[PDB]
Structure formats: structure tokens, C-alpha cells
Scaffold this active site. Structure first.
Site, PDB file in Angstrom:
ATOM      1  N   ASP A  72      45.639 -43.882  29.080  1.00  0.00           N
ATOM      2  CA  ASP A  72      45.882 -45.299  29.334  1.00  0.00           C
ATOM      3  C   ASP A  72      45.177 -46.156  28.288  1.00  0.00           C
ATOM      4  OD1 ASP A  72      46.567 -47.783  31.065  1.00  0.00           O
ATOM      5  OD2 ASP A  72      44.385 -47.834  30.964  1.00  0.00           O
TER       6      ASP A  72
ATOM      7  N   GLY B  82      43.664 -59.053  31.141  1.00  0.00           N
ATOM      8  CA  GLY B  82      42.794 -59.067  32.306  1.00  0.00           C
ATOM      9  C   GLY B  82      41.629 -60.045  32.327  1.00  0.00           C
TER      10      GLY B  82
ATOM     11  N   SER C  86      41.198 -62.541  37.925  1.00  0.00           N
ATOM     12  CA  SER C  86      41.377 -63.984  38.041  1.00  0.00           C
ATOM     13  C   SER C  86      42.379 -64.481  37.003  1.00  0.00           C
ATOM     14  CB  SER C  86      40.040 -64.709  37.870  1.00  0.00           C
ATOM     15  OG  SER C  86      39.574 -64.615  36.533  1.00  0.00           O
TER      16      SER C  86
ATOM     17  N   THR D  43      50.366 -49.558  34.071  1.00  0.00           N
ATOM     18  CA  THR D  43      50.000 -48.161  34.228  1.00  0.00           C
ATOM     19  C   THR D  43      49.569 -47.920  35.667  1.00  0.00           C
ATOM     20  OG1 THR D  43      49.117 -48.141  31.969  1.00  0.00           O
ATOM     21  CG2 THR D  43      48.557 -46.270  33.386  1.00  0.00           C
TER      22      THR D  43
ATOM     23  N   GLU E  73      73.232 -78.053  11.560  1.00  0.00           N
ATOM     24  CA  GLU E  73      74.567 -78.560  11.870  1.00  0.00           C
ATOM     25  C   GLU E  73      74.532 -79.667  12.917  1.00  0.00           C
ATOM     26  OE1 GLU E  73      77.474 -76.563  14.375  1.00  0.00           O
ATOM     27  OE2 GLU E  73      78.969 -76.737  12.772  1.00  0.00           O
TER      28      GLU E  73
ATOM     29  N   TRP F   1      80.577 -73.968   7.120  1.00  0.00           N
ATOM     30  CA  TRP F   1      81.740 -74.808   6.815  1.00  0.00           C
ATOM     31  C   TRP F   1      82.387 -74.535   5.450  1.00  0.00           C
ATOM     32  CZ3 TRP F   1      84.554 -77.699  10.083  1.00  0.00           C
ATOM     33  CH2 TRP F   1      83.976 -78.029  11.322  1.00  0.00           C
TER      34      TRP F   1
ATOM     35  N   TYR G 263      84.194 -84.228  14.111  1.00  0.00           N
ATOM     36  CA  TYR G 263      83.016 -84.164  14.976  1.00  0.00           C
ATOM     37  C   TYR G 263      82.150 -85.419  15.008  1.00  0.00           C
ATOM     38  CZ  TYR G 263      83.790 -79.203  15.948  1.00  0.00           C
ATOM     39  OH  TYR G 263      84.316 -78.007  16.386  1.00  0.00           O
TER      40      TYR G 263
ATOM     41  N   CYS H  72      86.444 -78.063  18.227  1.00  0.00           N
ATOM     42  CA  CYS H  72      86.418 -76.980  19.197  1.00  0.00           C
ATOM     43  C   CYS H  72      85.666 -77.438  20.443  1.00  0.00           C
ATOM     44  CB  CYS H  72      85.731 -75.770  18.585  1.00  0.00           C
ATOM     45  SG  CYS H  72      86.475 -74.255  19.104  1.00  0.00           S
TER      46      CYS H  72
ATOM     47  N   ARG I 161      87.567 -76.001  23.999  1.00  0.00           N
ATOM     48  CA  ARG I 161      88.963 -75.552  24.154  1.00  0.00           C
ATOM     49  C   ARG I 161      89.184 -74.074  23.840  1.00  0.00           C
ATOM     50  NH1 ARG I 161      91.369 -74.983  19.404  1.00  0.00           N
ATOM     51  NH2 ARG I 161      90.409 -75.959  17.563  1.00  0.00           N
TER      52      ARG I 161
ATOM     53  N   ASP J 118      85.117 -68.227  20.990  1.00  0.00           N
ATOM     54  CA  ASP J 118      84.814 -66.869  20.562  1.00  0.00           C
ATOM     55  C   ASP J 118      83.484 -66.452  21.194  1.00  0.00           C
ATOM     56  OD1 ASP J 118      84.509 -64.402  19.190  1.00  0.00           O
ATOM     57  OD2 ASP J 118      83.534 -65.425  17.501  1.00  0.00           O
TER      58      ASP J 118
HETATM   59  N1  LIG Z   1      42.514 -52.119  35.382  1.00  0.00           N
HETATM   60  C1  LIG Z   1      42.846 -53.091  34.525  1.00  0.00           C
HETATM   61  O1  LIG Z   1      43.956 -53.187  33.996  1.00  0.00           O
HETATM   62  C2  LIG Z   1      41.738 -54.112  34.217  1.00  0.00           C
HETATM   63  C3  LIG Z   1      41.808 -54.904  33.068  1.00  0.00           C
HETATM   64  C4  LIG Z   1      40.806 -55.835  32.784  1.00  0.00           C
HETATM   65  C5  LIG Z   1      39.721 -55.975  33.647  1.00  0.00           C
HETATM   66  N2  LIG Z   1      39.641 -55.180  34.803  1.00  0.00           N
HETATM   67  C6  LIG Z   1      38.515 -55.306  35.755  1.00  0.00           C
HETATM   68  O2  LIG Z   1      38.576 -56.613  36.362  1.00  0.00           O
HETATM   69  C7  LIG Z   1      37.254 -56.860  36.945  1.00  0.00           C
HETATM   70  C8  LIG Z   1      36.716 -58.270  36.597  1.00  0.00           C
HETATM   71  O3  LIG Z   1      37.728 -59.266  36.725  1.00  0.00           O
HETATM   72  P1  LIG Z   1      37.538 -60.580  37.702  1.00  0.00           P
HETATM   73  O4  LIG Z   1      38.566 -61.665  37.668  1.00  0.00           O
HETATM   74  O5  LIG Z   1      36.185 -60.789  38.314  1.00  0.00           O
HETATM   75  O6  LIG Z   1      36.883 -61.152  36.307  1.00  0.00           O
HETATM   76  P2  LIG Z   1      37.670 -61.688  34.951  1.00  0.00           P
HETATM   77  O7  LIG Z   1      39.075 -62.135  35.185  1.00  0.00           O
HETATM   78  O8  LIG Z   1      37.527 -60.548  33.794  1.00  0.00           O
HETATM   79  O9  LIG Z   1      36.713 -62.856  34.358  1.00  0.00           O
HETATM   80  C9  LIG Z   1      36.361 -63.989  35.157  1.00  0.00           C
HETATM   81  C10 LIG Z   1      35.636 -64.983  34.259  1.00  0.00           C
HETATM   82  O10 LIG Z   1      36.574 -65.465  33.233  1.00  0.00           O
HETATM   83  C11 LIG Z   1      36.393 -66.910  33.099  1.00  0.00           C
HETATM   84  N3  LIG Z   1      37.505 -67.723  33.675  1.00  0.00           N
HETATM   85  C12 LIG Z   1      38.533 -67.265  34.394  1.00  0.00           C
HETATM   86  N4  LIG Z   1      39.310 -68.293  34.743  1.00  0.00           N
HETATM   87  C13 LIG Z   1      38.771 -69.406  34.250  1.00  0.00           C
HETATM   88  C14 LIG Z   1      39.124 -70.752  34.290  1.00  0.00           C
HETATM   89  N5  LIG Z   1      40.224 -71.136  34.934  1.00  0.00           N
HETATM   90  N6  LIG Z   1      38.336 -71.654  33.668  1.00  0.00           N
HETATM   91  C15 LIG Z   1      37.236 -71.275  33.023  1.00  0.00           C
HETATM   92  N7  LIG Z   1      36.875 -69.997  32.971  1.00  0.00           N
HETATM   93  C16 LIG Z   1      37.620 -69.047  33.571  1.00  0.00           C
HETATM   94  C17 LIG Z   1      35.122 -67.231  33.891  1.00  0.00           C
HETATM   95  O11 LIG Z   1      34.003 -66.973  33.035  1.00  0.00           O
HETATM   96  P3  LIG Z   1      32.628 -67.789  33.257  1.00  0.00           P
HETATM   97  O12 LIG Z   1      31.947 -67.398  34.518  1.00  0.00           O
HETATM   98  O13 LIG Z   1      31.795 -67.525  31.896  1.00  0.00           O
HETATM   99  O14 LIG Z   1      33.051 -69.361  33.229  1.00  0.00           O
HETATM  100  C18 LIG Z   1      35.183 -66.222  35.029  1.00  0.00           C
HETATM  101  O15 LIG Z   1      33.880 -66.011  35.607  1.00  0.00           O
HETATM  102  C19 LIG Z   1      36.328 -55.799  36.338  1.00  0.00           C
HETATM  103  O16 LIG Z   1      36.211 -54.753  37.301  1.00  0.00           O
HETATM  104  C20 LIG Z   1      37.126 -55.314  35.134  1.00  0.00           C
HETATM  105  O17 LIG Z   1      36.749 -53.986  34.751  1.00  0.00           O
HETATM  106  C21 LIG Z   1      40.657 -54.253  35.086  1.00  0.00           C
HETATM  107  C1  LIG Z   2      39.885 -45.367  31.225  1.00  0.00           C
HETATM  108  C2  LIG Z   2      39.075 -46.528  31.788  1.00  0.00           C
HETATM  109  O1  LIG Z   2      37.716 -46.464  31.292  1.00  0.00           O
HETATM  110  C3  LIG Z   2      37.364 -47.597  30.603  1.00  0.00           C
HETATM  111  O2  LIG Z   2      37.386 -48.697  31.162  1.00  0.00           O
HETATM  112  C4  LIG Z   2      36.943 -47.480  29.132  1.00  0.00           C
HETATM  113  C5  LIG Z   2      35.450 -47.777  28.926  1.00  0.00           C
HETATM  114  C6  LIG Z   2      35.205 -49.210  28.430  1.00  0.00           C
HETATM  115  O3  LIG Z   2      35.818 -49.462  27.133  1.00  0.00           O
HETATM  116  C7  LIG Z   2      36.810 -50.416  27.106  1.00  0.00           C
HETATM  117  C8  LIG Z   2      37.165 -51.151  28.243  1.00  0.00           C
HETATM  118  C9  LIG Z   2      38.174 -52.115  28.199  1.00  0.00           C
HETATM  119  N1  LIG Z   2      38.465 -52.778  29.327  1.00  0.00           N
HETATM  120  C10 LIG Z   2      39.668 -53.617  29.529  1.00  0.00           C
HETATM  121  C11 LIG Z   2      40.938 -52.782  29.780  1.00  0.00           C
HETATM  122  C12 LIG Z   2      40.899 -51.385  29.777  1.00  0.00           C
HETATM  123  C13 LIG Z   2      42.061 -50.651  30.004  1.00  0.00           C
HETATM  124  C14 LIG Z   2      43.270 -51.308  30.232  1.00  0.00           C
HETATM  125  N2  LIG Z   2      44.390 -50.601  30.449  1.00  0.00           N
HETATM  126  C15 LIG Z   2      45.565 -51.215  30.670  1.00  0.00           C
HETATM  127  N3  LIG Z   2      46.659 -50.486  30.882  1.00  0.00           N
HETATM  128  N4  LIG Z   2      45.641 -52.559  30.677  1.00  0.00           N
HETATM  129  C16 LIG Z   2      44.553 -53.322  30.471  1.00  0.00           C
HETATM  130  N5  LIG Z   2      44.673 -54.645  30.486  1.00  0.00           N
HETATM  131  C17 LIG Z   2      43.320 -52.703  30.236  1.00  0.00           C
HETATM  132  C18 LIG Z   2      42.151 -53.438  30.008  1.00  0.00           C
HETATM  133  C19 LIG Z   2      38.845 -52.347  26.999  1.00  0.00           C
HETATM  134  C20 LIG Z   2      38.499 -51.620  25.857  1.00  0.00           C
HETATM  135  C21 LIG Z   2      37.485 -50.653  25.906  1.00  0.00           C
HETATM  136  O4  LIG Z   2      37.124 -49.933  24.798  1.00  0.00           O
HETATM  137  C22 LIG Z   2      38.213 -49.520  23.948  1.00  0.00           C
END
Ligand SMILES: NC(=O)c1ccc[n+]([C@@H]2O[C@H](COP(=O)([O-])OP(=O)(O)OC[C@H]3O[C@@H](n4cnc5c(N)ncnc54)[C@H](OP(=O)(O)O)[C@@H]3O)[C@@H](O)[C@H]2O)c1
Ligand SMILES: CCOC(=O)CCCOc1cc(NCc2ccc3nc(N)nc(N)c3c2)ccc1OC
Ligand SMILES: NC(=O)c1ccc[n+]([C@@H]2O[C@H](COP(=O)([O-])OP(=O)(O)OC[C@H]3O[C@@H](n4cnc5c(N)ncnc54)[C@H](OP(=O)(O)O)[C@@H]3O)[C@@H](O)[C@H]2O)c1
Ligand SMILES: CCOC(=O)CCCOc1cc(NCc2ccc3nc(N)nc(N)c3c2)ccc1OC
Lengths: 500, 504
Positions: free
Chosen positions: A47, A140, A143, A163, A280, A302, A328, A388, A408, A411
Site C-alpha cells: 500500500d 489524509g 478531518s 486500499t 470562435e 473556417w 452568425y 447550424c 438544425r 454531427d
Molecule cells: N489510512 C489512511 O489512509 C490514513 C491517511 C492519513 C492519515 N491517517 C491517520 O489519520 C489519523 C489522524 O487524522 P485526524 O483527522 O486526527 O488528523 P488530521 O486530519 O491528519 O489532522 C488534523 C489537523 O489538521 C489541521 N486542520 C484540519 N482541518 C483544519 C481546518 N479546517 N482549519 C485549520 N486547520 C485544520 C489541524 O491542525 P492544527 O491543530 O495544527 O491547527 C488539525 O488539528 C492518524 O491516525 C493518521 O495516521 C490515515
Molecule cells: C503501511 C502503514 O505503515 C505506515 O504508516 C508507514 C510508516 C510511516 O511512514 C509514512 C507514513 C505516511 N502516512 C500517510 C499515509 C500512509 C499510507 C497511505 N496509504 C494510502 N493508500 N493512502 C494514504 N492517503 C496514505 C497516507 C506517509 C508516508 C510515510 O513514509 C513513506
């Protein structure tokens, strides 16, 4: 100038700021969990590879990401914190971090945004970012995804790359679900599976099963075009045109396209020549009749009908080459005025239909006579070709300007998509001229046809799943309607299929 | 007449009525049985009465059947035999008997109220389509036996079947060997027709000594085309925008719609859920075709639709102070026949002035039917201020395929209650006449609507109309032809089999 149409001093109420379209990339478990609030619980290197590849690569073949042309990743601050300091910023991509606390300098491959995804999508729609940033990825976290699934951002979502990790992880406190088609949470968007991978096994040592899918929002409006093309092929009668070439034909059809928030119905299953469309149309609006004005900006549509040979065959031996006669736009601005040559002065001659429509729209939007026409029986023999797209009617509801085009002869392969784009532009411009927001384009077709030699090619096109329509953004305004230039506007996030 | 349009030799050929439309009356048991081969094996006087009434009575109020205006009943020979000689012919109706052996003269030995046809129902309907029986016969009823009913349910006859009046007798007769069954939607036997219940009676008991239960149904073939119209009105009421016209009257409005109506084989899309003023439609279209502008020509014929728009007060209100009363200016027809010509007054000579759009179209239809430029328009921006009203039906395009002429109308402003049904009928007629002028057969009418609207006051009336199930469309026949298109009169054509609902 004294006979031009003055634009309003202010934009229409409600008009949005420009926003980039984006794709969403996410990894979920089977219950829709994405993380514990600080990290991703599972370890699936495949992933990681997929996420890197999809967010890095450009539409071009084996093209290397550079400051000149790259993708952008938009992330929440917490997601930025979850990336270990040594792997950040994410290579080959502009890293956009959302944070109210942190700034850019607390660290040009990184940029902070004080606000949500909407503000990030606004920033990347700036002229500073639009030439260099090809695709925007919402990577991501929770939020940000929640905001992405919510208006206004949700309507800009091109695709979801999801994924699925086949793991049960009770530590997941943050979740993500794609709302199913027809459900209340789907907010009118019809999510469709475009592709699904086979179920695969991770080499992480736990034998974790996983698969990928790509989800897209159904483009009903383009499907409507393709259904018509398909109907014509299946059910159309055989007819022949003026050069004896076979067509398949039906009589009488109608399509609809939303122009709301400057959405531009440029078809995606075949690239439409926007620059030609735009040049055009502006040329129509100005009341032009000299096709050389178009051939000089490399718009050659044209050329065939403006040649010495063709004009002569039309009996128009007195016209200079590329002088099309009172076609036209001339009828639009000078209906009924006597024509001599293209370079003559026509100010205040004939009926200015565009001028009249613009004034009526501002004072009496309920009026039922806001129509303009180029079908002038008196002047047809003086034209290179009869029009046309020959008639258009305007309509106002809820501060939105709608337009109906009558055509009218249509194509389906080339003319139709071009003309949908023309009148989309026209409606947008007239909305701007009248202090209204763009509403709906209705397209009425008379003889709607496909060339019998384009059948096999069209059949190949009908298999393609339509992508989202792009948007039109004005980089500058003009004091007069007639002064708009192709360079004043920019089509953002137009991603049509390559040639058949 | 140099400026008129000459009708070809084939003027009558492509609109001659091949088969006259008809209704069907039948009594069945609950197994679909109708008889034992010789007679009907039940005794229900109330069905006999209903049968008599529905086949004898004419559409008007208290109109007595006469040789000039009556219904016809069509029966197989075996059914004629099953009727006691004392009671035949069935009084007040033309008795049409199908028989390969029995002649008209030989039947009278068992006025002119009997005819024998050597052939089946198709042959009978062919005979009834002739000028001798159309339009003097108001409704044809198939009443005959199983073989006649079977022929009624298969093409070509079935597509002309306007209504089925079915009596169900609640008995089960082993004795029954002949059957009649109405095919259900989507089935092969139904031939694309979708039978619907218009009415069903309460279950009643026969005064026949046996307490036999029975009931009546009237079934009609679904009119999808009129349902397009009704769905549109309903959509406007449900989700149309509130607007106000120039006078300040409230309106409910949608923008951009399209409807299709078949004109094949004499079909005329005169709406059934509310009676359309055909005579007015016809007089006005001919008036349009003649390039006419004096509305008094319509007034003199009891057609008053332009009266309020041609009065001294209204013309003055449009700044047309120099026009004589009823002079509408260069409206509609004037533009069709004289596009771009300078207008002075109605009684001037406009021969050869401007562009004759209709004549050009007629010429092109005969030489190049593939042409894509076959349009006429009344939308002349330079003449609009000279008109009493600018045209709402403002443009039309013709199209030809398989020897069939189709027409597309563009209408900018559409009053759903009155104007739209009127204009469908108008352009149906125009297409019919143009086809006759060009050696083509009538095909389809396509109707494009811009501002399609319903008056805010008219809402409740429309709602009551919306719950009516549309009946089958009528037909248009020509009693006679003319040398020139411009010479056609309203009395030259006849709308037949028009059975619209009552007013309310
Ligand atoms: N599995 C996946 O595909 C995936 C991908 C990415 C992340 N994750 C996981 O997601 C989790 C965290 O995400 P979650 O939402 O708590 O945190 P988040 O979306 O990563 O981040 C939240 C922070 O982003 C900023 N933010 C968001 N919206 C805002 C707005 N409208 N205005 C101003 N600032 C804004 C703020 O930062 P400030 O507090 O500095 O203002 C807020 O505290 C973790 O577990 C991470 O590993 C999973
Ligand atoms: C296998 C999971 O273990 C880990 O988390 C790796 C260790 C941390 O290293 C990293 C973390 C992230 N995090 C954000 C992230 C990760 C996977 C995602 N996958 C999809 N499909 N989509 C996402 N948006 C996504 C977002 C990004 C880059 C990193 O290093 C290259
Ligand atoms: N319950 C009801 O509503 C109802 C109504 C009417 C009759 N019925 C019942 O129907 C039963 C008899 O009907 P069924 O069909 O045998 O008889 P039928 O339909 O009444 O009559 C058949 C005769 O009509 C003539 N005919 C029909 N098609 C023809 C064609 N294509 N060409 C030439 N002649 C044609 C033939 O007369 P020839 O042999 O002389 O040439 C044929 O023998 C009886 O029991 C009667 O009571 C019931
Ligand atoms: C209740 C039955 O009692 C009898 O049989 C009466 C004695 C025979 O006298 C007649 C027979 C017929 N037969 C043809 C007939 C009868 C009823 C029908 N009803 C419907 N709904 N539909 C029919 N097509 C129909 C056809 C006609 C007229 C007669 O005398 C006026």
C-alpha cells in the site's frame, strides 16, 4: 467604444472563488478504520508503494516530476506528524500541510495553509500553482477526508483510490466510508467502482490480505451524450449529406448540462478543442465575419468555407478570401443590416440582439422573448454557410441564467461537443454581463447524426467511462463584453481520454 | 395563382384512410368464455341493455340515430345467425355482416342498414373507411364472434382498436368453447399495446332468477403521447418556478422540454383529457398558410381567438395606432410566405415580396429530402415591433426518412392549459398538409418548449385533469382535395373518432 456592451461593476451574488479538482487516496480496514488518531496501525508495504506511485506519477508517459510539472498532496497536520521526520517532505510532490498553528517556515516543496481542504483547493487554483500542479491528492487524515466528503469539496472530487486492508484493528478510532449510490449521505453523487484489483497477500510476514479499488463519481450528463450516440448507431436511419457521405440519423433530441459554479461541460471521452471553441465564440460575440482573424491564432475551422473556391461555388465572387458574409455573429449584433464587406463599418446597423438580451435580463428576468437568432432567410444566400446553431433562448430562475440552444444539424462526433462548449461559454459570459450566476445549458438537436465510417471508432468511445467535467476560471475581467480574450480565462483540471 | 403552391397528382394517396378505427364490445365469463359455438350460454338482460345502449347511442345529448349519423356494428355470420330473425337487423345501427357466401341481397330474405362483406374485419374496416361510411358512421363496434374478436386483436386491426367494453358474467361454463382474452402489458400477444382500465363498475346482481353476478369494464389503450403532456404539467405544478408575465399574472414555469407525437396512418394528436377547439385550430393554420394578417377573416368564421389581440385598444397599447382594427401586422403567416417584406396594411399586395419559406421547403422536399436546411421562421427581430404579438411558435424544421415527413416545432413560450394542445394540433395539421404537397407520408411531430408554464389560478383545474387517463387519439381524413395548398378549407377535412372527456 460607443457600441460595445459595458460589464457590471461587481460580480454576481453567490459566485465562488476558484477551486482545484482533487482525488482522494486512502487506506482502510474492513470496518472503515484508518488510524488510532496518531498513526496507521497495520504495516502493508504494498500500500505504501501504491500510495507513493499514484500520488507521484503524472499523466504523461515516463515523465519525471519537477518544479515545472508535479502533483500536490494535501494533508492534515497530524498526518504530517505521523510521517517520520527523515521521510518528509514526501519526494516528487508539493507537500500541502493544513495547520492553524504551524507555518511554512516552521520546517519550495512545503507550504502551510491556515484553513481546511477548501482553502488548500483555493490556493492550488492560484495562477502560481495551476501551470505546475497537474493533480491534487487528498492524502489524509480523518478531518480532511470528512471535509472532502462534504460540500463544497465533495463536488470537486474526481476519484477515490481506496486500499482495503483485510485486518481487524480495535485500536482504530478514526474512520472513513464512501457513501453508496442513492443513500442520503451520498449527497446526490453516484459513486461507481471503475476498477478493482484481485485480492492480494502482503509480504509483511502476517500474510495480510488487501486489494485496491478506484471509485469515480458518475458523470450522468456525458452518459446522456453517449446514450444518444449509441441510440443513433442502433436505431438511426441511413441518410446522406451534401457530399454523398452516409450518416446514421435521428430527428429530435434534447440534452442538459449544468454550468453552475462555472462548471464547463467539455466532454471527457474525446478531447474537445477548447482554444478554438473559445476563440470562435468571442469572434461571434464581437460580430466578426473575417475568418482570417481565426486562421491567424491557429484556429483553422473556417478555412475550408472561406477559400476562394468555396466562396465562388456559393456565388460569393465579390468577397475577399475568408470573408464569410453576414454569418452568425453579424446576425447576432446586426440582424437585417445590409452586408457589403467584412472591413466596413456596421455600428448601429440592424438589430443588436445580444445588447437587447443583456438589458432585458437586468430589468425583467421573467421575460419570454430573450432570444437571438442567426436564421435570417433574407441573408442566407449571402452567407458562406447557413447557421447550424441558429437560435438561443435565455431563462432566469433563482438568480441563475439558463440558455437553450437550437441546432438544425448535429454531427455527434465533432460538431456537437464543440457547440455544447461554445454555448456554455456564451451563457457564462452573458451571466457575467448581467450580474447573474451561470445556470443550465439545454441543447436541442434537429438532425442528429453519426458518420457511417465513424461507427467503429464511436463504438470504441462508448466503452469509456466518463470523467468529471472541468471548470472555467477568469484570471482577469474586462470593462466591455467584446474585449474578452482567450488568455483571460483558464480551463482547470480538464482530463480527457487520449485519442481512440 | 402563380404564387400559390400546386398540389401534386399524389395529393390524396398518402393520407387516404386505409382502415377505419373501431371499438369492441364483448361479454365473457370468468374463464374468458364467450359462447358454445352456437350461442351465449347465459341470460343477463342488463348486459343486453348495455350492449344495445353502447352500440346505438351517439356522442351528443339526445341525438337520434339516422342514416346521416349513426353507429355501425360488425359481426361474423355465425353471430348474425344466433340473433332471432325477428330482432334482426339490430335497429338504429348499420349491420355489417362478415360472410364468404352470404350476399347483401340474400341477407334481406331471412332503409339501408345491412351490408355483407366478403372477408374479415379488416375488409369491413376498409369498407367503412370509404367516404360513403366516413364520417357518417360515428363509431364502429366489433361485436361479432370469436373469429372476429381474434382478428380485432391482431395487426393491422388491433392498432385501430380505440376501446374495449367488456362485461364479465360471474359463472363458469364448461359449455364454452370459444374464448376472448385481453392481452396484458409487455406480452407478445399485446402487439406493443398497453391496455388500461378507464372504468370498472361495482359488482351487480342480475334480475334473471339466478342471482348472477356481473360487472362492466371499459378498457383503453395507453396513450403514452398524451401522458408526456400530463407528466409535464404535473412537473410544472410540483417544481416549477413562480413567475409573472407582462400583465402581472402569476405563473408556474419550467425551462426546456420536448414531446413526440406520431402522425402515421391518419393519427391526429388532439388531446383527450380536455377538448381542443379543432375548428379554430384548422381555420387558423390555413390562415397562417395563406400568409394572412387580417384577424377579421377568422372572426367572420366564428373563430374569435385573435379578437382581444386585434382590438383598437390592444393595437394602440402596442403603439400600432395606424393599423385598422383586426390588422395584426406582419405576424406568423406573413413571415412564412413573405419573410422580410415591408408591411404597410393587411389589404396591400404582397405577391412576390420577401422570402416564401413554405414554397422553398416544398420544392426542396421533392428534390432533396436529405437536406438539413428545411426550416421556416417567424422570428424576425426587425419586424417584431410591427407585430401585434411576437410569435411564440416561431420556428419549424422538416425532416424526411423512409418516405415519411417529420416536423420539429420550437416554441419559446408555452401555456400548457390552452396554447400547447392547440399548437400540437396546428403543427400536426401543417405536417399533414406539407406531406400531401410533397408526395410524402406523415411521420412524427416533435415539439420543443422553452418557457413551459401553467397559470397559478389554473392549478386546481389542471390537478383534476391530471387524474384522467388519456384515451386513444382521433384521426384526420380529407373529404376532398384542392389544386393549390392555399385553397384548402376547414370543411375539406374531418376529425373522426374524437372522444374527449367532459369539461371540468
Ligand atoms: N489510512 C489512511 O489512509 C490514513 C491517511 C492519513 C492519515 N491517517 C491517520 O489519520 C489519523 C489522524 O487524522 P485526524 O483527522 O486526527 O488528523 P488530521 O486530519 O491528519 O489532522 C488534523 C489537523 O489538521 C489541521 N486542520 C484540519 N482541518 C483544519 C481546518 N479546517 N482549519 C485549520 N486547520 C485544520 C489541524 O491542525 P492544527 O491543530 O495544527 O491547527 C488539525 O488539528 C492518524 O491516525 C493518521 O495516521 C490515515
Ligand atoms: C503501511 C502503514 O505503515 C505506515 O504508516 C508507514 C510508516 C510511516 O511512514 C509514512 C507514513 C505516511 N502516512 C500517510 C499515509 C500512509 C499510507 C497511505 N496509504 C494510502 N493508500 N493512502 C494514504 N492517503 C496514505 C497516507 C506517509 C508516508 C510515510 O513514509 C513513506
Ligand atoms: N359473448 C359475446 O360477447 C359474444 C358476442 C358475439 C358472439 N358470441 C358467440 O361466438 C360464437 C360463434 O363465434 P365464432 O367465431 O364461430 O363465429 P363468428 O365470429 O360469429 O362468425 C364466423 C363467420 O364469420 C365469417 N368470417 C370471419 N372471418 C372471415 C374472413 N376472414 N373471411 C371471410 N369470412 C369470414 C365466416 O362466415 P362464413 O362461413 O359464412 O363465410 C365465419 O364462418 C357463438 O357461440 C356466439 O354466441 C359471443
Ligand atoms: C344475455 C344473453 O341472452 C341472449 O343471448 C339474448 C337472445 C339472443 O338475442 C340476441 C343475441 C345477440 N347476440 C350477440 C351479442 C349479444 C350480447 C352481447 N353483449 C356484449 N356485451 N357484447 C356483445 N358483443 C354481445 C353480442 C344480439 C342481439 C340479440 O337480440 C337483441
Amino acid at each position: 467604444s460607443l457600441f460595445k456592451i459595458r460589464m457590471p461593476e461587481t460580480v454576481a451574488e453567490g459566485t465562488r472563488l476558484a477551486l482545484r479538482a482533487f482525488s482522494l487516496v486512502v487506506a482502510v480496514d474492513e470496518r472503515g478504520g484508518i488510524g488510532d488518531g496518531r498513526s496507521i496501525p497495520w504495516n502493508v508495504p504494498e500500500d505504501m508503494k501504491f500510495f507513493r506511485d499514484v500520488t507521484t506519477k503524472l499523466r504523461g508517459k515516463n515523465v519525471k516530476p519537477s518544479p515545472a510539472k508535479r502533483n500536490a498532496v494535501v494533508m492534515g497536520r497530524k498526518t504530517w506528524d505521523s510521517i517520520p521526520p527523515k521521510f518528509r517532505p514526501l519526494p516528487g510532490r508539493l507537500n500541502v500541510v493544513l495547520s492553524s498553528t504551524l507555518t511554512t517556515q516552521h520546517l519550495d516543496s512545503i507550504v502551510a495553509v491556515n484553513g481546511g481542504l477548501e482553502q488548500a483547493l483555493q490556493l492550488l487554483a492560484s495562477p502560481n500553482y495551476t501551470p505546475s500542479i497537474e493533480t491534487v491528492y487528498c492524502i489524509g487524515g480523518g478531518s480532511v477526508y470528512a471535509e472532502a466528503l462534504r460540500p463544497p469539496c465533495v463536488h470537486l472530487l474526481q476519484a477515490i483510490y481506496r486500499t482495503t486492508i483485510r485486518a481487524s484493528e480495535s485500536s482504530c478510532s478514526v474512520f472513513f466510508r464512501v457513501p453508496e449510490s442513492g443513500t442520503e449521505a451520498a449527497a446526490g453523487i453516484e459513486w461507481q467502482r471503475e476498477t478493482i484489483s484481485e485480492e492480494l497477500t502482503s509480504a509483511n510476514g502476517n500474510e495480510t490480505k488487501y486489494y485496491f479499488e478506484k471509485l469515480i463519481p458518475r458523470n450522468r450528463e456525458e452518459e446522456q451524450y453517449l446514450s444518444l450516440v449509441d441510440r443513433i448507431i442502433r436505431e438511426g436511419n441511413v441518410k446522406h449529406d451534401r457530399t454523398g457521405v452516409g450518416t446514421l440519423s435521428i430527428f429530435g433530441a434534447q440534452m442538459r448540462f449544468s454550468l453552475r459554479n462555472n462548471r464547463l461541460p467539455l466532454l471527457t471521452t474525446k478531447r474537445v478543442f477548447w482554444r478554438g471553441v473559445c476563440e470562435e465564440l468571442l469572434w461571434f460575440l464581437r460580430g466578426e465575419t473575417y475568418a482570417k482573424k481565426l486562421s491567424d491564432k491557429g484556429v483553422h475551422i473556417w478555412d475550408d468555407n472561406g477559400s476562394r473556391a468555396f466562396l465562388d461555388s456559393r456565388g460569393l465572387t465579390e468577397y475577399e478570401e475568408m470573408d464569410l458574409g453576414p454569418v452568425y455573429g453579424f446576425q447576432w449584433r446586426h440582424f437585417g443590416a445590409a452586408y457589403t464587406h467584412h472591413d466596413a463599418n456596421y455600428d448601429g446597423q440592424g438589430v443588436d440582439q445580444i445588447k437587447a438580451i443583456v438589458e432585458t435580463l437586468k430589468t425583467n428576468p421573467d421575460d419570454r422573448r430573450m432570444l437571438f437568432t442567426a436564421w435570417n432567410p433574407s441573408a442566407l444566400p449571402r452567407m458562406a454557410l447557413p447557421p447550424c446553431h441558429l437560435l438561443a433562448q435565455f431563462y432566469v430562475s433563482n438568480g441563475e441564467l439558463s440558455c437553450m440552444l437550437y441546432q438544425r444539424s448535429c454531427d455527434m462526433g465533432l460538431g456537437v461537443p464543440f457547440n455544447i462548449a461554445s454555448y456554455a461559454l456564451l451563457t457564462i459570459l452573458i451571466a457575467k454581463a448581467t450580474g447573474l450566476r451561470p445556470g443550465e445549458l439545454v441543447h436541442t438537436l434537429g438532425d442528429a447524426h453519426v458518420y457511417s465510417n465513424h461507427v467503429e471508432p464511436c463504438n470504441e468511445q462508448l466503452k469509456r467511462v466518463p470523467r468529471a467535467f472541468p471548470y472555467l476560471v477568469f484570471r482577469r475581467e474586462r470593462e466591455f463584453l467584446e474585449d474578452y480574450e482567450e488568455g483571460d480565462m483558464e480551463v482547470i483540471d480538464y482530463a480527457p481520454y487520449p485519442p481512440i
